[PDB]
Design an enzyme around this catalytic site. Structure first.
Site, short mmCIF file in Angstrom:
data_model
loop_
_atom_site.label_atom_id
_atom_site.label_comp_id
_atom_site.label_asym_id
_atom_site.label_seq_id
_atom_site.Cartn_x
_atom_site.Cartn_y
_atom_site.Cartn_z
CD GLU A 60 -2.73 -1.16 2.64
OE1 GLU A 60 -3.78 -1.94 2.65
OE2 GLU A 60 -2.66 -0.22 3.40
CD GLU A 61 2.45 3.06 5.09
OE1 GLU A 61 1.45 3.30 5.52
OE2 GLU A 61 3.75 3.32 5.28
O1 LIG Z 1 -0.04 11.55 13.88
P1 LIG Z 1 1.35 11.80 13.11
O2 LIG Z 1 2.61 12.46 13.33
O3 LIG Z 1 0.75 12.18 11.55
O4 LIG Z 1 1.70 10.30 12.60
C1 LIG Z 1 0.82 9.47 12.03
C2 LIG Z 1 0.24 8.36 12.94
O5 LIG Z 1 1.09 7.95 13.90
P2 LIG Z 1 1.36 8.10 15.52
O6 LIG Z 1 0.41 7.04 15.85
O7 LIG Z 1 3.11 7.71 15.65
O8 LIG Z 1 1.20 9.78 15.64
C3 LIG Z 1 -0.67 7.31 12.29
O9 LIG Z 1 -1.31 6.22 13.16
P3 LIG Z 1 -2.47 6.88 14.08
O10 LIG Z 1 -2.26 7.99 14.95
O11 LIG Z 1 -3.48 7.68 12.90
O12 LIG Z 1 -3.13 5.49 14.50
C4 LIG Z 1 0.30 6.69 11.31
O13 LIG Z 1 -0.50 5.41 10.77
P4 LIG Z 1 -0.07 4.01 10.56
O14 LIG Z 1 0.41 3.56 12.34
O15 LIG Z 1 -1.25 3.42 10.04
O16 LIG Z 1 1.50 3.82 9.63
C5 LIG Z 1 0.88 7.66 10.30
O17 LIG Z 1 1.82 7.12 9.20
P5 LIG Z 1 1.30 6.83 7.79
O18 LIG Z 1 0.26 8.08 7.21
O19 LIG Z 1 2.50 7.22 7.08
O20 LIG Z 1 0.70 5.45 7.60
C6 LIG Z 1 1.70 8.66 10.83
O21 LIG Z 1 2.22 9.58 10.04
P6 LIG Z 1 3.65 9.39 9.47
O22 LIG Z 1 3.71 9.18 7.83
O23 LIG Z 1 3.92 11.04 9.38
O24 LIG Z 1 4.63 8.64 10.23
MG LIG Z 2 1.65 3.61 7.70
MG LIG Z 3 -0.59 2.52 5.71
MG LIG Z 4 -2.07 3.27 8.18
#
Ligand SMILES: O=P(O)(O)O[C@H]1[C@H](OP(=O)(O)O)[C@@H](OP(=O)(O)O)[C@H](OP(=O)(O)O)[C@@H](OP(=O)(O)O)[C@H]1OP(=O)(O)O
Ligand SMILES: [Mg+2]
Ligand SMILES: [Mg+2]
Ligand SMILES: [Mg+2]
Ligand SMILES: [Cl-]
Ligand SMILES: [Cl-]
Length: 133
Positions: A60-61
């Site tokens: 996906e990523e």
């Molecule tokens: O809150 P952000 O700084 O934008 O970071 C988010 C957040 O990660 P954290 O949990 O570390 O805050 C998301 O997780 P949730 O809080 O939404 O559950 C995570 O999603 P995943 O765990 O599904 O990877 C996402 O990552 P991404 O959008 O790359 O999938 C990541 O953003 P970053 O890309 O900046 O690490």
């Molecule tokens: Mg992710």
């Molecule tokens: Mg993802």
């Molecule tokens: Mg995700």
């Protein structure tokens, strides 16, 4: 989203290497800050094996597929309260258009291991630690 019994969010990720030499790894851009790099990964789905979640999230990523290798370890981020299963994946297929390229313009790039550690250290020191062993 799914959770361990201590309320940590459950995640899986792969170290996506070019070859069995494990010298060059694929990072992807942060969704929140696209000028930053991260290890591709994300949340496990209900009843989803961690190895299956890992392969799905990197498709996906990062838009890659390959041969799943060993579990490296299970890594916690205390501040964000998540727990990530990290696997080795040897990339054998590179897709031109993938879910996150189409949907959010996510970027990907190969890094020598020492350079991956460098670009992860500031915002993602736990992800830099994935490479320590
Ligand atoms: O809150 P952000 O700084 O934008 O970071 C988010 C957040 O990660 P954290 O949990 O570390 O805050 C998301 O997780 P949730 O809080 O939404 O559950 C995570 O999603 P995943 O765990 O599904 O990877 C996402 O990552 P991404 O959008 O790359 O999938 C990541 O953003 P970053 O890309 O900046 O690490
Ligand atoms: Mg992710
Ligand atoms: Mg993802
Ligand atoms: Mg995700
Ligand atoms: Cl390699
Ligand atoms: Cl992290």
């Amino acid at each position: 989203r799914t959770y361990d019994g201590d309320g940590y969010k459950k995640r899986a990720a792969c170290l996506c290497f070019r070859s069995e030499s494990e010298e060059e790894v694929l990072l992807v851009s942060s969704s929140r800050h696209p000028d930053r790099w991260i290890v591709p990964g994300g949340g496990m789905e209900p009843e989803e094996e961690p190895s299956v979640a890992a392969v799905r999230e990197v498709c996906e990523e990062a838009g890659v597929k390959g041969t799943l290798g060993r579990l490296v370890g299970i890594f916690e981020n205390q501040e964000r309260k998540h727990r990530t299963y990290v696997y080795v994946l040897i990339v054998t297929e590179v897709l031109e258009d993938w879910e996150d390229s189409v949907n959010i313009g996510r970027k990907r790039e190969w890094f020598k291991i020492e350079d991956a550690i460098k670009v992860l250290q500031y915002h993602k020191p736990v992800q830099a630690s994935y490479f320590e062993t």
